[PDB]
Enzyme design. Structure first.
Site, PDB file in Angstrom:
ATOM      1  N   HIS A   1      54.567  24.496  20.335  1.00 41.49           N
ATOM      2  CA  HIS A   1      54.179  25.754  20.950  1.00 41.49           C
ATOM      3  C   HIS A   1      54.394  25.819  22.451  1.00 41.49           C
ATOM      4  O   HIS A   1      54.368  24.827  23.129  1.00 41.49           O
ATOM      5  CB  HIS A   1      52.710  26.009  20.675  1.00 41.49           C
ATOM      6  CG  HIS A   1      52.283  25.646  19.294  1.00 41.49           C
ATOM      7  ND1 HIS A   1      51.550  24.521  19.024  1.00 41.49           N
ATOM      8  CD2 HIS A   1      52.486  26.252  18.105  1.00 41.49           C
ATOM      9  CE1 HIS A   1      51.303  24.456  17.732  1.00 41.49           C
ATOM     10  NE2 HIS A   1      51.864  25.495  17.149  1.00 41.49           N
TER      11      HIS A   1
ATOM     12  N   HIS B   1      52.690  26.901  25.743  1.00 33.69           N
ATOM     13  CA  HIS B   1      51.338  27.174  26.258  1.00 33.69           C
ATOM     14  C   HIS B   1      51.366  27.962  27.549  1.00 33.69           C
ATOM     15  O   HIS B   1      52.381  28.034  28.207  1.00 33.69           O
ATOM     16  CB  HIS B   1      50.579  25.877  26.492  1.00 33.69           C
ATOM     17  CG  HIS B   1      50.165  25.181  25.234  1.00 33.69           C
ATOM     18  ND1 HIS B   1      48.858  24.847  24.964  1.00 33.69           N
ATOM     19  CD2 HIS B   1      50.890  24.751  24.179  1.00 33.69           C
ATOM     20  CE1 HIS B   1      48.797  24.231  23.801  1.00 33.69           C
ATOM     21  NE2 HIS B   1      50.019  24.159  23.306  1.00 33.69           N
TER      22      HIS B   1
ATOM     23  N   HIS C   1      47.530  28.413  23.820  1.00 27.04           N
ATOM     24  CA  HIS C   1      48.793  28.982  23.380  1.00 27.04           C
ATOM     25  C   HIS C   1      49.109  30.226  24.176  1.00 27.04           C
ATOM     26  O   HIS C   1      48.232  31.037  24.401  1.00 27.04           O
ATOM     27  CB  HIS C   1      48.694  29.368  21.914  1.00 27.04           C
ATOM     28  CG  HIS C   1      48.672  28.206  20.988  1.00 27.04           C
ATOM     29  ND1 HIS C   1      49.209  28.267  19.725  1.00 27.04           N
ATOM     30  CD2 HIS C   1      48.175  26.955  21.133  1.00 27.04           C
ATOM     31  CE1 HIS C   1      49.046  27.098  19.131  1.00 27.04           C
ATOM     32  NE2 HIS C   1      48.417  26.286  19.963  1.00 27.04           N
TER      33      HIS C   1
ATOM     34  N   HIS D   1      46.440  33.459  16.184  1.00 30.55           N
ATOM     35  CA  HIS D   1      47.471  32.443  15.932  1.00 30.55           C
ATOM     36  C   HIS D   1      48.191  32.750  14.627  1.00 30.55           C
ATOM     37  O   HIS D   1      47.633  33.378  13.725  1.00 30.55           O
ATOM     38  CB  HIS D   1      46.894  31.023  15.891  1.00 30.55           C
ATOM     39  CG  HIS D   1      47.929  29.956  15.696  1.00 30.55           C
ATOM     40  ND1 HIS D   1      48.846  29.620  16.666  1.00 30.55           N
ATOM     41  CD2 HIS D   1      48.198  29.159  14.630  1.00 30.55           C
ATOM     42  CE1 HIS D   1      49.636  28.665  16.201  1.00 30.55           C
ATOM     43  NE2 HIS D   1      49.259  28.363  14.972  1.00 30.55           N
TER      44      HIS D   1
ATOM     45  N   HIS E   1      50.847  34.436  18.160  1.00 33.12           N
ATOM     46  CA  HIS E   1      50.910  34.286  19.609  1.00 33.12           C
ATOM     47  C   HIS E   1      52.378  34.330  20.031  1.00 33.12           C
ATOM     48  O   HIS E   1      53.238  33.886  19.295  1.00 33.12           O
ATOM     49  CB  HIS E   1      50.301  32.964  20.077  1.00 33.12           C
ATOM     50  CG  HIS E   1      48.849  32.801  19.761  1.00 33.12           C
ATOM     51  ND1 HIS E   1      48.279  31.576  19.494  1.00 33.12           N
ATOM     52  CD2 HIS E   1      47.845  33.702  19.698  1.00 33.12           C
ATOM     53  CE1 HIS E   1      46.987  31.733  19.279  1.00 33.12           C
ATOM     54  NE2 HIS E   1      46.698  33.012  19.395  1.00 33.12           N
TER      55      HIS E   1
ATOM     56  N   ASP F   1      53.848  30.894  19.785  1.00 36.92           N
ATOM     57  CA  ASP F   1      53.771  30.186  18.514  1.00 36.92           C
ATOM     58  C   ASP F   1      55.152  30.010  17.923  1.00 36.92           C
ATOM     59  O   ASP F   1      55.632  30.881  17.210  1.00 36.92           O
ATOM     60  CB  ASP F   1      52.903  30.946  17.520  1.00 36.92           C
ATOM     61  CG  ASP F   1      51.429  30.858  17.832  1.00 36.92           C
ATOM     62  OD1 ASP F   1      50.995  30.014  18.621  1.00 36.92           O
ATOM     63  OD2 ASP F   1      50.660  31.643  17.275  1.00 36.92           O
TER      64      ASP F   1
ATOM     65  N   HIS G   1      53.021  18.426  19.229  1.00 37.57           N
ATOM     66  CA  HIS G   1      51.644  18.159  18.797  1.00 37.57           C
ATOM     67  C   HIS G   1      51.463  17.021  17.819  1.00 37.57           C
ATOM     68  O   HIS G   1      52.379  16.632  17.122  1.00 37.57           O
ATOM     69  CB  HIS G   1      51.068  19.425  18.170  1.00 37.57           C
ATOM     70  CG  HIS G   1      50.427  20.344  19.155  1.00 37.57           C
ATOM     71  ND1 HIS G   1      49.064  20.507  19.239  1.00 37.57           N
ATOM     72  CD2 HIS G   1      50.957  21.134  20.109  1.00 37.57           C
ATOM     73  CE1 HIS G   1      48.782  21.355  20.206  1.00 37.57           C
ATOM     74  NE2 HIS G   1      49.914  21.749  20.752  1.00 37.57           N
TER      75      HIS G   1
ATOM     76  N   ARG H   1      47.654  16.857  21.950  1.00 31.74           N
ATOM     77  CA  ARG H   1      48.917  17.095  22.645  1.00 31.74           C
ATOM     78  C   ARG H   1      49.624  15.787  22.967  1.00 31.74           C
ATOM     79  O   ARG H   1      49.230  15.059  23.854  1.00 31.74           O
ATOM     80  CB  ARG H   1      48.659  17.900  23.913  1.00 31.74           C
ATOM     81  CG  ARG H   1      48.050  19.239  23.615  1.00 31.74           C
ATOM     82  CD  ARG H   1      47.633  20.001  24.854  1.00 31.74           C
ATOM     83  NE  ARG H   1      46.893  21.220  24.507  1.00 31.74           N
ATOM     84  CZ  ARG H   1      46.469  22.126  25.378  1.00 31.74           C
ATOM     85  NH1 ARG H   1      46.690  21.966  26.670  1.00 31.74           N
ATOM     86  NH2 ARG H   1      45.826  23.202  24.955  1.00 31.74           N
TER      87      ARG H   1
HETATM   88 CU   LIG Z   1      50.226  24.019  20.870  1.00 29.65          CU
HETATM   89 ZN   LIG Z   2      49.269  29.938  18.636  1.00 30.22          ZN
END
Ligand SMILES: [Cu+2]
Ligand SMILES: [Zn+2]
Ligand SMILES: [Cu+2]
Ligand SMILES: [Zn+2]
Lengths: 153, 153
Positions: free
Chosen positions: A46, A48, A63, A71, A80, A83, A120, A143
């Site tokens: 993702h 951020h 995000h 999400h 998002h 995403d 992730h 993360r």
């Molecule tokens: Cu993420």
């Molecule tokens: Zn998200």
């Protein structure tokens, strides 16, 4: 003919390089590159909100979500902006990333440049998790490696 | 009230954090923070074109220069947009940065976000060097530590 690039790095063995290329301002963004040191299988992936690396990847915030939505998976409409879903890692820990996405952009309201990309711990459940957290983080966990998205030649 | 931040890092001991804050879109940008591990004295300090960290700080390319001008000091009119001049390091290697600049910006044509900040080996001669290279790089030498400029909370 805009391009961007990001060097993913972290506390542990996970590292990589990810490229961005948007041919046309109104058009889709190709995302490609190679991440390594990854535990075999699916990984959340993702963009951020913040390009902040002060206190590691945690500083990147949540995000990237300028349209204030829930999400979801990248194909999902209710998602998002940041995403980008999952990336898949093979036996020897490599993940050969090749996504193409139409929500993110390298220009304007949706501009991801100057923000953080983040790979992730676990897989992103694409919002279909049923619990509270799945609607936020995707239950994709900690993360592993991250980097600030930068303008490229 | 746009803010940015950048984590300066490199191959050697030089490292630091530098903050940006532009209160108004048309207004000046305060730059502040603390860099350490620096050789005592003056150091060149510029925003470079690319947010590319692929092959280290070298990937960042040249001084950010969208108006196609010659190198100079920050007060000089004839300067690169990214020419923020020098930063001063004290005895114990620490450089308490506190600049305020009006050419750079966190929005628009002059947008430095997504580009690389870079602290330098030698001091920037502010273009008054007389030689060919002083008109380009400022004769400020190699790239000690750098980082991609990111959107901050
Ligand atoms: Cu993420
Ligand atoms: Zn998200
Ligand atoms: Cu420089
Ligand atoms: Zn310059």
């Amino acid at each position: 003919a805009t391009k961007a690039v990001c060097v993913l790095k972290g506390d542990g063995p996970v590292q990589g390089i990810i490229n961005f290329e948007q041919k046309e301002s109104n058009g889709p963004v190709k995302v490609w590159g190679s991440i390594k040191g990854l535990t075999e299988g699916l990984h959340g992936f993702h963009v951020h909100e913040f390009g902040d690396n002060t206190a590691g990847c945690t500083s990147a915030g949540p995000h990237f979500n300028p349209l204030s939505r829930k999400h979801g998976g990248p194909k999902d409409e209710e998602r998002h902006v940041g995403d980008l879903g999952n990336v898949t890692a093979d036996k020897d820990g490599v993940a050969d990333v090749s996504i193409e996405d139409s929500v993110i952009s390298l220009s304007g309201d949706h501009c991801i440049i100057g923000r953080t990309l983040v790979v992730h711990e676990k897989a992103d459940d694409l919002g279909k998790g049923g619990n509270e957290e799945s609607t936020k983080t995707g239950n994709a966990g900690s993360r592993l490696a991250c980097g600030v998205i930068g303008i490229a030649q």
